[PDB]
């Protein structure tokens, strides 16, 4: 087959940001190169025919170009939902079809710290001897909001897992899912438990507490 790449692999933008991204191959694929977009939880979308052939159902904000070993894509208008990842892929009678690495295009607002929420843990976590502390982390961006667990506000080497979620334009922010595993012994010696976040948007150290009796 052939190898393929895009420049860059992820870019940050904003409402109306005329994004300019590139796809390069070693040998030109003539006129049959099609870039593609991907929205999470949604079907992808074929975007361009030829180089700049516009089809039904899409606003005219797009503009695709490039030639020979290099092809580009520059979109005149960026409505905020244009946050997506984008794939490049050629067309040929050869039944195998290769897709280049995607470009995780981002919409950047600012550097924002996460919020705090909490739900009581499930009953299986108490029964298994692995005591757990729940703290719902939401409404932060950019992604790298480093999360640490300070039991009695004590810093430790580890005890933190992360699985970050996606943009929700309803809040224009990320959210995070975590996992904590600890022995039953550590629960008795300590009294009040909370989680800490180390984000670049913090101006001072932050620690949170709440009431179990609240709801």
């Amino acid at each position: 087959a052939i190898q393929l790449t895009q420049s860059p692999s992820s870019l940050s933008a904003s409402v109306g940001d005329r994004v300019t991204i590139t796809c390069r191959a070693s040998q030109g694929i003539s006129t049959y190169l099609a870039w593609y977009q991907q929205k999470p939880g949604k079907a992808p979308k074929l975007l361009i025919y030829g180089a700049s052939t516009l089809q039904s159902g899409v606003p005219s904000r797009f503009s695709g170009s490039g030639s020979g070993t290099d092809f580009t894509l520059t979109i005149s208008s960026l409505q905020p939902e244009d946050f997506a990842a984008y794939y490049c892929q050629q067309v040929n009678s050869y039944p195998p079809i290769t897709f280049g690495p995607g470009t995780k295009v981002d919409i950047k607002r600012t550097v924002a710290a996460p919020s705090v929420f909490i739900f009581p843990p499930s009953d299986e976590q108490l029964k298994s001897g692995t005591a757990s502390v729940v703290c719902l982390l939401n409404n932060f961006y950019p992604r790298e909001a480093k999360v640490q667990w300070k039991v009695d506000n004590a810093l430790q080497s580890g005890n933190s897992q992360e699985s970050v979620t996606e943009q929700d334009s309803k809040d224009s922010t990320y959210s995070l899912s975590s996992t904590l595993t600890l022995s039953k012994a550590d629960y008795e010696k300590h009294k009040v438990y909370a989680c800490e976040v180390t984000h670049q948007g913090l101006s001072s150290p932050v620690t949170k507490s709440f009431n179990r009796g609240e709801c």
Binding site: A43, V91, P95, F99, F119, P120, S122, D123, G213, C215
Partner: protein, 222 residues
């Protein structure tokens, strides 16, 4: 616009076999052609091709003999059959409507594949509610606990507020362990306590258990 109906769920040991179905609606499939797609979370995205429009059939090299296609033009129904799914053949599958026939336009409902060493299991029912402030507060959020079970599908139903589609419930996510976990949070008016008896349960799909029970307030005074 042209629409279709898909179908399929596969849960077999390695080397899985099943037959599928996918029928377009609104137009005869004799003129228009359309191929199945792979939409594997994590793994990525793969596709299929068709005969007599693009010709022959697109399978992977080892998949070539391990997946088969046919077509029923008069029925306007398309079916997919496999005999031996691979170890990593564990994915959800859609189908993609074609107008220029090398670009996808419209999707159906889906088709999932499961090959896991874990066996059928079912979770329990652990609903949650806020404190006694609901006696005056018109609306508040509730809760439920479901975890450590066998394939994602879990359905949570409440007999108050909006319809059954309003419950915040989605299929879970698999990790190396083989178990699954999610949560349910619903916000319904609290004035229905004195008029409708509350019922909560887990409608776990591969559970093989059917027990229904009612829900009563906390009654901390007792």
């Amino acid at each position: 616009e042209v629409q279709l109906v898909e179908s399929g769920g596969g849960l077999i040991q390695p080397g899985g076999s099943l037959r599928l179905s996918c029928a377009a609606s609104g137009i005869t499939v004799s003129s228009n052609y359309m191929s199945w797609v792979r939409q594997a979370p994590g793994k990525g995205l793969e596709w299929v091709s068709v005969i007599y429009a693009g010709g022959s059939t697109f399978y992977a090299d080892s998949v070539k003999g391990r997946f088969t296609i046919s077509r029923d033009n008069s029925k306007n129904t398309l079916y997919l059959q496999m005999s031996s799914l691979r170890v990593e053949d564990t994915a959800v599958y859609y189908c993609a409507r074609d107008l220029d026939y090398y670009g996808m336009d419209v999707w159906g409902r889906g088709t999932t594949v499961t090959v896991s060493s874990a066996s059928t299991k079912g979770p329990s029912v652990f609903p949650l509610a806020p404190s006694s402030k609901s006696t005056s507060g018109g609306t508040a959020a509730l809760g439920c606990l479901v975890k450590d079970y066998f394939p994602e599908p879990v359905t949570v139903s409440w007999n108050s507020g909006a319809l059954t589609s309003g419950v915040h419930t989605f299929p879970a996510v698999l990790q190396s362990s083989g178990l699954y976990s999610l949560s349910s949070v619903v916000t319904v008016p609290s004035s229905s306590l004195g008029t409708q008896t509350y019922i909560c349960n887990v409608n776990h799909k591969p559970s093989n258990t059917k027990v229904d029970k009612r829900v009563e307030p906390k009654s901390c005074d007792k």
